[PDB]
Design a protein around this ligand. Structure first.
Ligand SMILES: *[C@@H]1O[C@H](CO)[C@@H](O)[C@H](O)[C@H]1NC(C)=O
Ligand SMILES: *[C@@H]1O[C@H](CO)[C@@H](O)[C@H](O)[C@H]1NC(C)=O
Ligand SMILES: *[C@@H]1O[C@H](CO)[C@@H](O)[C@H](O)[C@H]1NC(C)=O
Ligand SMILES: *[C@@H]1O[C@H](CO)[C@@H](O)[C@H](O)[C@H]1NC(C)=O
Ligand SMILES: *[C@@H]1O[C@H](CO)[C@@H](O)[C@H](O)[C@H]1NC(C)=O
Ligand SMILES: [Zn+2]
Lengths: 194, 597
């Protein structure tokens, strides 16, 4: 007899960078999606393979809350069957993804005058990321055949780059805090329902 | 494993680095412009230096990727702009010499003033001082005094610095494998890598010379009319068959003839179109003006202003507490930031200037999807020209009767058409002979065809023959006339003002013919027509990522720069001028001077 703690997932003061994206398991509770759907504070709210009305009465045994922060125009790259830097090199959903996508405007908080360099992203990687794979490696990317030996230089780049956030950007760039919810079913009983 | 991968990997790393550091220097410059303090100067200097060293540092790695092995065109276009090392190729000893001379002549232009022999203790600057005297005074001596005293005092200082200015810029081109430094400015229109669209650096000279030949019939009559009007007001000081005196051209250098519209107005009893007294009774402010301007771009389908636009922009004089430059500029800071800095007053000119400054924003928002190195005008002449075509439709009587400014019952007839065109004829056509003359002058000096002692001799031979203007007083080798001009001492290539004139009417005839307009061209309005707005939007979003000759083919259906729209635009005026000039002598001889009696 407990509510699923979405309060600490959404209203947490500081999220992880997109490569550092934090996974939090949600189980053995009851989740109310009505206040989420009726808040109207969310810029982009979608669901895939499930209707937002139908999931009100329904039971899924495992709910994973993914959290990260990306660019406003890069929100379109979070979806099944998508490419681009955020999709390939950072956070990759499989084509069969059954969950939902949530985003809202963080510009009133996460951004400050002068830019905030804590938020980072992985610009280069040797290959694409498999579904739901966190890669935190700081290893120097290698573009050419010249051995890097872990130092900056010609054709050896530090892959982690920062998003500068000032308050003064246009609506397109502004930072959004995106929360991706995954839903699966396995042999375990489903404790999460309406 | 190829250079192409190493090239895309490098530039992708370069894109997100150029986005962050450029926005710092651009925001700092915004702080300097809006708020002028000693503290805000160091903030722009430190931010401007990091961006200067960044492009200087990235140019070291850029030359390591040979363009010979690069098959993809878009990567080759990006590196070609980055790989040029500019002034860094020169030796370090002359490096300090160049920037100092650039800043030295700049301060001479800014701090330059004129002083009368009568009371030496009092003196006046150029701005406002001489620009007020040259425009507002009808006196022969007063205009002549301002004309000579500025070139005599300032010209003596800049000439010995300008000669060394020529020597340094020449060796920079030969180290870049250019025939001269004049070839460096003409290299902006160079096109390579596309079969059949290649536009050679030497093709520009042959084209501009051919385009100006067909403008001469229009200009010789336009010059014959201005000479006829000023002759009646100055019978003794102006010869009927001779060239116009320099100081009587309406301003210092004869660039804009708009100041002469007062005496040259075709019809004095017919009311001129003025939206000023209409805006006062409605009590509009800077807020509604751009709303009417933004509503214009909504009618053509172009996107509207961002929410951060109205918040971050300073649209008015920020009080008497802090001083700010009121020169209208369109600031593109990158990363979706678009700002217009203007001191807004209620006037007919500001409403027409409003659509111009907003034109760049609609232009920069189109190619903003391109990477930073590809974020620029398709050429150096489109970026400014796109803002002018929007101002054209805004000045037409039809667009003014729609938005409520001009009365719906306003009468239109033959005498109204000529009045509105001749005002546009003085500004648009009057600046072409001055612009072609200036560019052909710099090009022959940098090439070396003109010895240093023939500069003042070759200058006023182009004044008389091309522009039909003669010097009121002879200048010896000591004076340097061009150096006193803004764009000459400030090291800005001035050919931009010739091309935007030809490229604005091509767009004008192209978009209006797409809107199925009927009748004369000058009465065209692109409002409510999406056919033109979508056709124009095809080119605007391309940026410099495509050859301008290719991008121009979409809009105007023509691969070559042509003046046919320009004569078609003034064709109503061109027929009327020859009728008033049939009793006057058309043409001018270069052997006449006011000081030879
Ligand atoms: C976060 O806080 C807001 C207001 O404080 C509240 O409306 C919202 O429900 C909170 N988030 C969750 C998941 O409850
Ligand atoms: C302008 O700069 C001065 C210097 O710090 C500062 O005191 C003032 O508040 C600034 N004004 C505005 C409007 O930012
Ligand atoms: C060149 O590379 C860009 C991306 O780096 C690509 O979009 C473009 O299609 C390439 N050029 C050609 C001709 O394929
Ligand atoms: C621009 O147009 C869009 C179209 O829906 C509108 O939502 C937006 O509010 C407009 N911009 C402003 C500042 O009103
Ligand atoms: C565009 O259409 C609107 C709607 O009828 C009209 O009010 C407006 O006057 C039109 N524009 C022009 C320039 O006539
Ligand atoms: Zn402009």
């Amino acid at each position: 007899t407990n509510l699923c703690p979405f309060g600490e997932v959404f209203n947490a003061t500081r999220f992880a960078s997109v490569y550092a994206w934090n996974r939090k398991r949600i189980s053995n509770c009851v989740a109310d999606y009505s206040v989420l759907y009726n808040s109207a504070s969310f810029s982009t709210f979608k669901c895939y393979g499930v209707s937002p009305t139908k999931l009100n009465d329904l039971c899924f045994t495992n709910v994973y809350a993914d959290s990260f922060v990306i660019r406003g125009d890069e929100v379109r790259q979070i979806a099944p069957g998508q490419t681009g830097n955020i999709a390939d090199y950072n956070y990759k959903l499989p084509d069969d993804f059954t969950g939902c996508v949530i985003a809202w405007n963080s510009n009133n908080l996460d951004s400050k005058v002068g830019g905030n360099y804590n938020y980072l992203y992985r610009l280069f990687r040797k290959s694409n990321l498999k579904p739901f794979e966190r890669d935190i490696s700081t290893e120097i990317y290698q573009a050419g055949s010249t051995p890097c030996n872990g130092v900056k230089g010609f054709n050896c780049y530090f892959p982690l780059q920062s998003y500068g956030f000032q308050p003064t950007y246009g609506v397109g760039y502004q930072p959004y805090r995106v929360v991706v919810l995954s839903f699966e079913l396995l042999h375990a009983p489903a404790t999460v329902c309406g | 494993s190829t250079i192409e991968e190493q090239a895309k990997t490098f530039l992708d790393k370069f894109n997100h680095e150029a986005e962050d550091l450029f926005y710092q220097s651009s925001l700092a410059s915004w702080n300097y412009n809006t708020n002028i303090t000693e503290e805000n100067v160091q903030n722009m200097n430190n931010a401007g230096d990091k961006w200067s060293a960044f492009l200087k540092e990235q140019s070291t790695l850029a030359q390591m990727y040979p363009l010979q092995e690069i098959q993809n065109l878009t990567v080759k276009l990006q590196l070609q702009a980055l790989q040029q090392n500019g002034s860094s190729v020169l030796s370090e000893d002359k490096s300090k010499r160049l920037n100092t001379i650039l800043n030295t002549m700049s301060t001479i232009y800014s701090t330059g003033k004129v002083c009368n022999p009568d009371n030496p203790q009092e003196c006046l600057l150029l701005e406002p001082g001489l620009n007020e005297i040259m425009a507002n005074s009808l006196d022969y001596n007063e205009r002549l005094w301002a004309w000579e005293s500025w070139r005599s005092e300032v010209g003596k200082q800049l000439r010995p610095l300008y000669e060394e200015y020529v020597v340094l810029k020449n060796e920079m081109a030969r180290a870049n494998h250019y025939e001269d430094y004049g070839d460096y400015w003409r290299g902006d229109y160079e096109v390579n890598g596309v079969d059949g669209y290649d536009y050679s650096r030497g093709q520009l000279i042959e084209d501009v010379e051919h385009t100006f030949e067909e403008i001469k019939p229009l200009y010789e009559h336009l010059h014959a009319y201005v000479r006829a009007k000023l002759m009646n007001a100055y019978p003794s000081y102006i010869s009927p068959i001779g060239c116009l005196p320099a100081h009587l051209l309406g301003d210092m250098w004869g660039r804009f003839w708009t100041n002469l519209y007062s005496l040259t107005v075709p019809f004095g009893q017919k009311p001129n179109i003025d939206v000023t007294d209409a805006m006062v009774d409605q009590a509009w402010d800077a807020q509604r003006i751009f709303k009417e301007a933004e509503k214009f771009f909504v009618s053509v389908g172009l996107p509207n202003m961002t929410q951060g636009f109205w918040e971050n922009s300073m649209l008015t004089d920020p009080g008497n507490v802090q001083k700010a430059v009121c020169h209208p500029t369109a600031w593109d800071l990158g990363k979706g930031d678009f700002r217009i800095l203007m001191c807004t007053k209620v006037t007919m000119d500001d409403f027409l200037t409003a659509h111009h400054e907003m034109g760049h924003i609609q232009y920069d928002m189109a190619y903003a999807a391109q990477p930073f190195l590809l974020r620029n005008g398709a050429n150096e002449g489109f970026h400014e020209a796109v803002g002018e075509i929007m101002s054209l439709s805004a000045a037409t009587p039809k667009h003014l009767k729609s938005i409520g400014l001009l009365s719906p019952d306003f009468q239109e007839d033959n005498e109204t058409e000529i009045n509105f065109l001749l005002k546009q004829a003085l500004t648009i056509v009057g600046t072409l002979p001055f612009t072609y003359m200036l560019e052909k002058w710099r090009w022959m000096v940098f090439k070396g065809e003109i010895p240093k002692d023939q500069w003042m001799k070759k200058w006023w031979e182009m004044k008389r023959e091309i522009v039909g203007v003669v010097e009121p007083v002879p200048h010896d080798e000591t004076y340097c006339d061009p150096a006193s001009l803004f764009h000459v001492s400030n090291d800005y290539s001035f050919i931009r003002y010739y091309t935007r004139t030809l490229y604005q009417f091509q767009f004008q005839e192209a978009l209006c013919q797409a809107a199925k307009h009927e009748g004369p061209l000058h009465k065209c309005d692109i409002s409510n027509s999406t056919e033109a707005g979508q056709k124009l939007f095809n080119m605007l979003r391309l940026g410099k990522s495509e050859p301008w000759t290719l991008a121009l083919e979409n809009v105007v259906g023509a691969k070559n720069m042509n003046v046919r729209p320009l004569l078609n635009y003034f064709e109503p005026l061109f027929t009327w001028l020859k009728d008033q000039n049939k009793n006057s002598f058309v043409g001018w001889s270069t052997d006449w001077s006011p000081y030879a009696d």
